Write a protein that binds this ligand. Structure first.
Ligand SMILES: *[C@@H]1O[C@H](CO)[C@@H](O[C@@H]2O[C@H](CO)[C@@H](O[C@H]3O[C@H](CO)[C@@H](O[C@@H]4O[C@H](CO)[C@@H](O[C@@H]5O[C@H](CO)[C@@H](O[C@H]6O[C@H](CO)[C@@H](O)[C@H](O)[C@@H]6O)[C@H](O)[C@@H]5O)[C@H](O)[C@@H]4O)[C@H](O)[C@@H]3O)[C@H](O)[C@H]2NC(C)=O)[C@H](O)[C@H]1NC(C)=O
Ligand SMILES: *[C@@H]1O[C@H](CO)[C@@H](O[C@H]2O[C@H](CO)[C@@H](O[C@H]3O[C@H](CO[C@@H]4O[C@H](CO)[C@@H](O)[C@H](O)[C@@H]4O)[C@@H](O[C@@H]4O[C@H](CO)[C@@H](O)[C@H](O)[C@@H]4O)[C@H](O)[C@@H]3O)[C@H](O)[C@H]2NC(C)=O)[C@H](O)[C@H]1NC(C)=O
Ligand SMILES: *[C@@H]1O[C@H](CO)[C@@H](O[C@@H]2O[C@H](CO)[C@@H](O)[C@H](O)[C@H]2NC(C)=O)[C@H](O)[C@H]1NC(C)=O
Ligand SMILES: [Fe+3]
Ligand SMILES: [Zn+2]
Ligand SMILES: [Zn+2]
Ligand SMILES: [Zn+2]
Length: 341
């Protein structure tokens, strides 16, 4: 009847998927690939059914005909009466973060500094801040704005990979998967925290989830929120408490996508799966938790309360919203219809 194949990106996701697999009695199973881009291709081929993606990849996948099915939903303050699965999604704040101790650094003095990005093509780590930088500079030359960076998915021998560290052994430098030490929200933030870089483009939640004891990770257990500052677009710096007033943009939530002809089936199984291994699930911290991976954000972001139904039966353009879609288009003109494969 119903069996779903999930696409895991890199070996750590693979491992988490295998566990979910064994726990679901094989109701879910796993395919693995090296990059999100490849995973998308497996789905198009029909060798994989689904994966959860950042909005920048939702855009890629969309041109290829894939569709959003369920969105990530994190703890809400407003919109409280509704059960999470039917609660509207809020979106996340894309911020630029720096060290307080690095005085005098503002949005207007980023040129020639060192940067930490979650990965090329992602929303908070790339699309927003690079689009803004392309716009106010007039130049499509974004590889030349920062002196060095860690930008996973960029050419390993270019300046945009210069700060990436690879794995344990120094292998896989700048691969866009968790093998790369400075990959994703948590890796970019760690890139700033270790003073490898001057600024990190991550979301508001990351700063909080890795400071003041929220993470027992050794590179973080000792970090304090007051030690960081957010760069606002008007040239000022604020405490990380002012995010709602000092952000680069509001990002659409990460969401699960699948081929359109598989959407109904994918939706059904996952709804059941969260009942079982979700935030309050039947089995959930006893045997297995779909939304926990030790601050690593494997398959899903760790702050996910549930996957929510969409309503309005959104196309991918509707889901990301016209504002966001026009920034990608304009940025994409730098390096308008097709499917990237
Ligand atoms: C940037 O990202 C970071 C990291 O993710 C965000 O920080 C997180 O934000 C969330 C929610 O926004 C935090 O909420 C969590 O914390 C609580 C405990 O840890 C949890 O329980 C809360 O209990 C309450 C129950 O509804 C909620 O608020 C309460 O509601 C009343 C008013 O809001 C009020 O009760 C009475 O007293 C008032 C007196 O002033 C009266 O006026 C009222 O009328 C009423 O009688 C209480 O004051 C009370 O606060 C609350 O929302 C929670 O439900 C909760 O489960 C949740 O998990 C989360 O902890 C936090 N993480 C960290 C590390 O801080 C940050 O918000 C982001 N910021 C932006 C701007 O985007
Ligand atoms: C980098 O720089 C590029 C190039 O300028 C910039 O490009 C874009 O800039 C803006 C940002 O979206 C965009 O403006 C559009 O404005 C109107 C209005 O869109 C509506 O907004 C209101 C309120 O939300 C509402 O009417 C609708 O709900 C829409 O959301 C848009 O369409 C108009 O629609 C109304 C009716 O709805 C109509 O009366 C008008 O005649 C008009 O059709 C415009 O067409 C614009 O699309 C720019 O258009 C867009 N510019 C280009 C060249 O594409 C990027 O955003 C910048 N990149 C980054 C990351 O910042
Ligand atoms: C594997 O998937 C099936 C399909 O939902 C689950 O078994 C179903 O259980 C529900 C609730 O009792 C029934 O309504 C269905 O008719 C059952 N289907 C069949 C054919 O067995 C089962 O719970 C799933 N297992 C796990 C661990 O996820
Ligand atoms: Fe994202
Ligand atoms: Zn089936
Ligand atoms: Zn805003
Ligand atoms: Zn519609």
């Amino acid at each position: 009847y119903t069996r779903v194949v999930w696409c895991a990106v890199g070996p750590e996701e693979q491992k988490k998927c295998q566990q979910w697999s064994q726990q679901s009695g094989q109701n879910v199973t796993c395919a693995t690939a090296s990059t999100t881009d490849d995973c998308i291709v497996l789905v198009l081929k029909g060798e994989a059914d689904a994966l959860n993606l950042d909005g920048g990849y939702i855009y890629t996948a969309g041109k290829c005909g894939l569709v959003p099915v369920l969105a990530e939903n994190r703890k809400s303050s407003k919109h409280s009466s509704l059960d999470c699965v039917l609660r509207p999604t809020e979106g996340y704040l894309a911020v630029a973060v720096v060290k307080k101790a690095n005085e005098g650094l503002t949005w207007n003095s980023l040129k020639d500094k060192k940067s930490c990005h979650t990965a090329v093509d992602r929303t908070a780590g790339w699309n927003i801040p690079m689009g803004l930088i392309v716009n106010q500079t007039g130049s499509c030359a974004f590889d030349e704005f920062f002196s060095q960076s860690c930008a996973p998915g960029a050419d390993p021998k270019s300046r945009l990979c210069a700060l990436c560290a690879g794995d344990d052994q120094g292998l896989d430098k700048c691969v866009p998967n968790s093998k790369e030490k400075y990959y994703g929200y948590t890796g970019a933030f760690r890139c700033l925290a270790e003073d490898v870089g001057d600024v990190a483009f991550v979301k508001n939640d990351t700063v909080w989830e890795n400071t003041n004891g929220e993470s027992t990770a050794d590179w973080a257990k000792n970090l304090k929120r007051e030690d960081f500052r957010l760069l606002c677009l008007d040239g000022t710096r604020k405490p990380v408490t002012e995010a709602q007033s000092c952000h680069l943009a509001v990002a659409p939530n990460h969401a699960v996508v699948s081929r359109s002809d598989r959407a109904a089936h994918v939706e059904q199984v996952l709804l059941h799966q969260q009942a079982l291994f979700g935030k309050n699930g039947k089995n959930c911290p006893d045997k297995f938790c779909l939304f926990k991976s030790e601050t690593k954000n494997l398959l899903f972001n760790d702050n996910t309360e549930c996957l929510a139904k969409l309503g309005g039966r959104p196309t991918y353009e509707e889901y990301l919203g016209t504002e966001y879609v026009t920034a990608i288009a304009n940025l994409k003109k730098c390096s308008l219809e097709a499917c990237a494969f």
